[PDB]
Design a protein around this ligand. Structure first.
Ligand SMILES: Cc1ccc(NC(C)(C)C(=O)O)cc1
Length: 330
């Protein structure tokens, strides 16, 4: 089997991408935020505290003839941005782009933190990291991809995120028309439960490539590119007037600037992020200070190849017995 679904930016900045997901029978379609940095499929639901729901579409298990309470199971997750959610668990039929999994754990939120409530465009998350990170207790549950894997033509999914445009998540096949040149594959460590890999270096604009190992994660649920402070300082030093602002929370730059590209290495291959992808617009409406799309990871504990980086590539998440990542230009 295979599946193919379009993923759509939630706003004009590509802050996140939503993909329609069919849950239950008859289908309830919710727009979920496919996260390769986490491993829970959770949804706004009829059980979510009413004051914490503000425009999201909810899953109502009592209206699904295939829903079953997973008795005794609870979940609770805290993300790297400080947001969180928790609740109980149903199993139900879940379909993405024509690919159907029966018995998928659907984590129904009883509580969500304020950033979820305040974003009406996101109805939940679909985790695509390794199932070892799934938070369901006392019986850990598998991700949608792990449940689908055995049925897929090939045990892979691909992320093809658009710049200011829709893109595609494919399951079970690699669309050879979706990229240029060849796909360069690179080793993955699953020791932390992430799609963790080592970039071979970087360049700023037309500058020389610096060969240096940068360990980080491929994370479709993170908006920006978070790299070591040395690398980030080297980038922003090429933008007149750019500075790190403690009050704003990162590097800002004059909105009048033209940003240089940023290149990252994948083996001997190179992925070029155009400068325009690094512009996240005014820090507040009407400001002439703009927020940068490359930020320091120093306060995180891990480097994160988020959407800014991934949208410059066609990315293969190869879930074979020994997982690997593939990157191609497009
Ligand atoms: C509405 C919303 C709220 C939070 C996030 N951040 C997530 C994906 C949870 C993270 O892992 O940092 C994304 C969207």
């Amino acid at each position: 089997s295979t599946g193919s679904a379009t993923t759509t930016p939630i706003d004009s900045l590509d802050d996140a991408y939503i993909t329609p997901v069919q849950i239950g029978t008859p289908a309830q379609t919710l727009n979920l935020d496919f996260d390769t940095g986490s491993s829970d499929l959770w949804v706004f639901s009829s059980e979510t505290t009413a004051s914490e729901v503000d425009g999201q579409t909810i899953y109502t298990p009592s209206k699904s003839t295939t829903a079953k309470l997973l008795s005794g199971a609870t979940w609770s997750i805290s993300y790297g941005d400080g947001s969180s959610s928790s609740g109980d668990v149903y199993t139900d039929t879940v379909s993405v782009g024509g690919l159907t999994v029966t018995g998928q754990a659907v984590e129904s939120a009883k509580k969500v933190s304020s950033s979820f409530t305040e974003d009406s465009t996101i109805d939940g998350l679909l985790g695509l990291a390794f199932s070892t990170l799934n938070t369901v207790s006392p019986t850990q549950q598998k991700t949608f991809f792990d449940n689908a894997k055995a049925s897929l033509d090939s045990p892979v999914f691909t992320a093809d995120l658009g710049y200011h445009a829709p893109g595609t998540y494919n399951f079970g096949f690699i669309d050879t028309t979706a990229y240029t040149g060849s796909i360069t594959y690179t080793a993955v460590s699953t020791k932390q439960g992430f799609w963790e890999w080592t970039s071979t270096g970087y360049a700023v604009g037309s500058g020389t490539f610096k060969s240096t190992s940068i360990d980080g994660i491929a994370d479709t649920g993170t908006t920006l590119l978070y790299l070591p402070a040395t690398v980030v300082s080297a980038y922003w030093a090429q933008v007149s007037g750019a500075k790190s602002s403690s009050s704003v929370g990162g590097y800002v730059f004059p909105c009048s600037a033209t940003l240089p590209s940023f290149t990252f290495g994948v083996g001997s291959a190179r992925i070029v992020i155009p400068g325009d992808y690094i512009d996240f617009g005014p820090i507040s409406t009407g400001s002439s200070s703009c927020f940068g799309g490359i930020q320091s990871s120093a306060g995180i504990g891990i480097n994160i190849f988020g959407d800014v980086a991934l949208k410059a590539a066609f990315v293969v998440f190869n879930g074979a017995t020994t997982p690997t990542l593939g990157f191609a230009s497009k």
